[PDB]
Amino acid sequence: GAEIYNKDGNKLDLYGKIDGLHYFSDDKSVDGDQTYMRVGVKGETQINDQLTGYGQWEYNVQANNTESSSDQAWTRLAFAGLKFGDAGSFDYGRNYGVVYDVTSWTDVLPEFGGDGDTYGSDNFLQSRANGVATYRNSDFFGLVDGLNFALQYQGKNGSVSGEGATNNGRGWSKQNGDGFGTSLTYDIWDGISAGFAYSHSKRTDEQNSVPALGRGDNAETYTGGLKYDANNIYLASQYTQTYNATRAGSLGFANKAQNFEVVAQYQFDFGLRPSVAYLQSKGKDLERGYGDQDILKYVDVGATYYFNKNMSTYVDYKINLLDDNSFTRNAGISTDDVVALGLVYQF
Amino acid sequence: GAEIYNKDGNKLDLYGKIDGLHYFSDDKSVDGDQTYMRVGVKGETQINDQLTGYGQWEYNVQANNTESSSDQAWTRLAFAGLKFGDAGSFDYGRNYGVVYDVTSWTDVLPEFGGDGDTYGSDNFLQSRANGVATYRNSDFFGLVDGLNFALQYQGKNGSVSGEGATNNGRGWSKQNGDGFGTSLTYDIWDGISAGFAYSHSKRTDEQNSVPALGRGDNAETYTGGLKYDANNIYLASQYTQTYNATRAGSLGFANKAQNFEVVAQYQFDFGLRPSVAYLQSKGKDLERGYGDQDILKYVDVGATYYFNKNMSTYVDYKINLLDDNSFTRNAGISTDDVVALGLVYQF
Amino acid sequence: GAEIYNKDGNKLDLYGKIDGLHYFSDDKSVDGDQTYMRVGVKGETQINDQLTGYGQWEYNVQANNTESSSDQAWTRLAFAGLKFGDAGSFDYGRNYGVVYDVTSWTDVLPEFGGDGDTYGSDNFLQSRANGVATYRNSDFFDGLNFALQYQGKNGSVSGEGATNNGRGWSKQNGDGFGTSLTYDIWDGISAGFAYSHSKRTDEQNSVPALGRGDNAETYTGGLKYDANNIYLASQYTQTYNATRAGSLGFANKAQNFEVVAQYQFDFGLRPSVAYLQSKGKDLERGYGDQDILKYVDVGATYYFNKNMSTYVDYKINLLDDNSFTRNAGISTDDVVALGLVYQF
C-alpha cells in the first residue's frame, strides 16, 4: 500500500515492512536477532487506452548486524514492463521465475517456508532470478475466465572469470545457462485452483566441475499444485520433481529430487491465523557415497495475529525431523528446531 | 518532517538530511571530505482506541568515497512497536540503548560529540544496538507529569563462529552477551531535568580472549545527568562510570572508566547558535603497564547558523587535549585537532 | 521527477528509473544482464526572498547479480547548496565536475557514451567527484553561464598521501580547480569552454607504470545545435596526465573527440549516430602513441511517453587488438544493448 503519487496517468506506490524478529535455536548460525526491513516502489504509467507501462523495485535491508558489517542490503526485484490490455504483459529484469507461480501457494507460513527451504533464490527459475523475460497471459485472451499462463526465458548467468563468464558472474550454486519455463493455473471452482509449471535450463561447466555433487547438461523442474482458499480456510500443496536443479546444501546439486509442501490455515474474525505445515525434500543418486538423502524435513506450527492491514505479530515453530548425519554436517544443513517471534509494521 | 502519506489511520513520515561536510586535521584518517546523507521513514498506524502500532527505519549513506568503494551504507535504526496509551510502549529491533536517554543530553554539539567519543555504537546499551526489547513509560502512567522510565533487554550478539556465535556475529568490540538496562528522567520544571540510567550486560568470550585490555564477565554503566533547556539557554552535563564497557581504542576495554561531558549553548533570534563543550574519558587499571590513561580529552567550540527549519551551516572546532603517548599510538586514538565546515539540507 | 511533497515553502521531488537492460558481446566481462535502477530526491526550501536552500541525492542500485553479491549499490550524487536569487549558487558534496558542463553535450547516446568512455567517474573534475565546491552564475552578473569549482585532495588509503576517504590511484586526486563558460550564440546554438587543473598524488606517480607529472589538466571546447527536432553536438578535449590508459595508468597527453547526430520524430522515435575516440600520446614502456577508445555508435530510442521508453544501441568497435589493449584491459569487441525503461 501507500500511493504517494497519482497524477496525469502516472502512479507511484511505496510499500515495505519493518520486521522486528528473533530466532531461538541450538543452531548458532540461525539463533539470535533477525530484524530486517523491506522497501519497494511499484510504478505505473498509462501510455494509451490499450497500453500501460510499469516498473517495480524491492530491496531487502538487514538490521541485525552492526554499522561496520558488510553486504547487509540487496535487491530482490527490479523489472520494467508493458501491459497490452488482455493480450498479456511483458517484463524483463530481476523477477520471480514462473515455477513460483505455483509453489508460492505453500509459501504462506508465519515466518518459515518459501525460498531457502525446498528451493532457493538464484536457483534457475524456481524463485527470484537475474535476467528473466516473462510473458503473461490472463484469462486466455479474455476468453476462459480464471485461466492464466506464462512463458519465460532466462539468459546465461555464468562464472566470475574464465570461459564460462558473463559480466554478472557468481558462484556455481547461483549460476545458470540459457533456460526457459512455463506455468499454467486454473481456478476450477471459486476457492479451488490447480496449477502446473515446467522449467528447463542448461547447466554451466563450473556446476559440472567444481562441486562434487550433481552432474548433467540440463536442469529441469516439474511442478503441480492445488489450493483451496475460501470460507476462512486455506489449504495448499505443492509437489515438484527436479533434475540437477535442487541444492544439496553446500555440496552441490541432487541429480534427482522430490519436494513436497502442504499447509493448512484458518482465519478467525478477531485476527488470529493459526498454521500447520509439512515440508520435505528427498535427494536421490548423490555422488561420493551419499546416495538417497533427506535435504529438508520439518513440521511447522505457528500463528499470526493481524492487528490490522499495517501491523501484525507472530510465532512460528519449526520442528526439525532430519537426522544428523555426515551428509547434513558436510553440506551445512541444519537439523535443529527453531522458534521465531516477530512484530511487523507494514506500509 | 515531510508527511507523504496520511490516510485511513495510517501515516508515513519521510525524513533525512544531506550533509555537505569537510574536516581539516593533521590526522590523515579524519582529514578531508565527509559528505554523507541520512534517509528514513517513521510510520504509525491506529489500531483501536487504546492501541497504536508504529515502526521506524533510518539509513546512513556515505557520499565521500567512490562508486567502486565498499561498505558505504548502513542501517542506524530499524524497529517496530506498539503504544498502549499511558500503560506504556514496547518495541524490538535495532534501537538506542536506554543509557542514551540521559547521555543524549550532551550530544548537541554542532558536529562532534555523541557516538565515537566517550561511548560508541554497538557498544552494549550505550547507543544504537542490535536486538533490544524496550518498554517505555511517560509521565508514570499519566499520574506524575514529567517522570519517564524505561526497561530494556538485549539478547546475546556474539562471535562470527565458534562456541560463542550467533547468526549475526561481529568482532569482539561490538559483541555483547545477554543484558538489561533502565533509565529514569524527571522534569522538575518544564526546562530543568535530571536523569539516571543503569545497564548490565554479560561479556562474551572473545572480549576476554582476543584483545589485550579489559577482563571481566560483566559490563556495567552508571550514568547521571542534568539539563537546563529554556529561555534560549542550553546547559547540560552527564557523568558516567563504566566497568569493562568503555573501549580503550583498538586495544580492548578499560576495566573501569570515568566519562564526563558538559556543554553550554545560546540561541540568538537571528539564527546563530554558539556552543562550547568539554569531554573526557579517563580509563583506570589497564593491563600491560598502562595503568591510568586518558582515552578522550578535548574542548569544543563552534556554532550553527539556522537559515530555517530545513537548512543550516556550521563550524566546529575540536581542541584536542590528549598527550601523544604509547597508549594513544597503540590504541589508534587521535591526538590532533579538527575543524569541521558543513552545509546541511534537511527534510 | 515526482513531487511527493510541497508545503510551507519546502518541496521534495522523488525521481529515478528502472532499466531492464541486456548487453550482447563477445567480451564476456560486458555481455549478459545489466538491469539496474536509480533513485533520488531533489529538495528545495525557501529561506527568504533572495535565498533558497536545496539538496540532492542520487543512488545507483544494480539488480543484475545475486542477493549474496557485494558492492551492488553506490551514491552518484549527494550535495547541499544555496541559491542567491538569480545572482548564482554554491554547493558542496559529491557532484559533477565542471568539465562535464561542456562534455555533457555529447552524453546523449541511447545507452553507451558518457562516463566510462573518453573520461570516467572519480576522474579529477571530468565527471562525478567527491568533495567539490561549486560556484555557478547565470547571465554573468546575459545568457552566459560561468562556474568556478574547487576540490580538496582525495588520496591514498594509508601512508603519506592518505585522507579519510582513501581509494586507489586511478580515482585519487590532489587539490584542484576548474572553470567553465557556456553561451547560447543563436537560439539553438551553444558554445562552451572548460578548464581544470589538479595536483596529482604520490601513488599516481609511483604505483602505475604509465603517466608521470605533478599536475593534471583539461582543456575542453564544445558545440551544440538543438532545435527543429535536430540534435548535433561535438566535444574536443585535450588532457595532460588526466585520461586513463585502462588499468596501466594515465596518458601523459591525450586527445578526445566526441560527436553525435540525432533526430526526434513526432511519433516518439529518436535515431542516433555518434563517433568517439581517445588518442593517447607519449606513453611509457615503449607504448608511444596508442588508441585508448575508438568506435562508431548507432541506435535508437522509442519513447512511449515521458515515463516509458525502449532502445537499442550498437557499439561498432574500431580498436585494433594489440599489446596495449590486452595489457591495459581495453575491450575491442562490439556491443549491442536492448533495454526497456520505466522512469518517474
Residue numbers in the entry:
A (entry chain B), B (entry chain C): 0 to 346
C (entry chain A): 0 to 140, 144 to 346
Per the authors:
OmpK36 GD, referred to as simply ‘OmpK36’, is a 373 amino acid outer membrane porin from Klebsiella pneumonia involved in nutrient and antibiotic diffusion in gram negative bacteria, while Cld is a heme-b-containing homodimeric oxidoreductase from Cyanothece sp. PCC7425, consisting of 181 amino acids per monomer. The effectiveness of AnACor is demonstrated for long-wavelength data sets collected at 3.54 Å, on a crystal of the membrane protein OmpK36 GD, and at 4.13 Å, on a crystal of the heme-binding enzyme chlorite dismutase (Cld). The choice of these two samples for this study was motivated by their crystallization in low-symmetry space groups, posing a challenge for the conventional absorption correction methods used in standard X-ray diffraction scaling programs.
Data from OmpK36, which crystallizes in the monoclinic space group C2, were collected at a wavelength of λ = 3.54 Å. In total 12 sulfur atoms are found, from two methionine residues and two sulfates in the trimeric structure. For OmpK36, the analytical absorption correction (AC) gives equivalent merging R factors to spherical harmonics correction (SH), with an overall R merge of 0.119 for both. Notably, the AC strategy leads to an increase in the mean I/σ(I), from 16.42 (SH) to 21.37 (AC), and a stronger anomalous signal, as measured by the anomalous slope (1.69 with AC, as opposed to 1.31 with SH). AC generally gives better results than SH, with the exception of the heights of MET310 in chain B and SO4-1 in chain C, which are larger in the SH data. For both data sets, when employing the SH correction strategy, the resulting spherical harmonics terms are distributed over a large range (0.5–1.5).
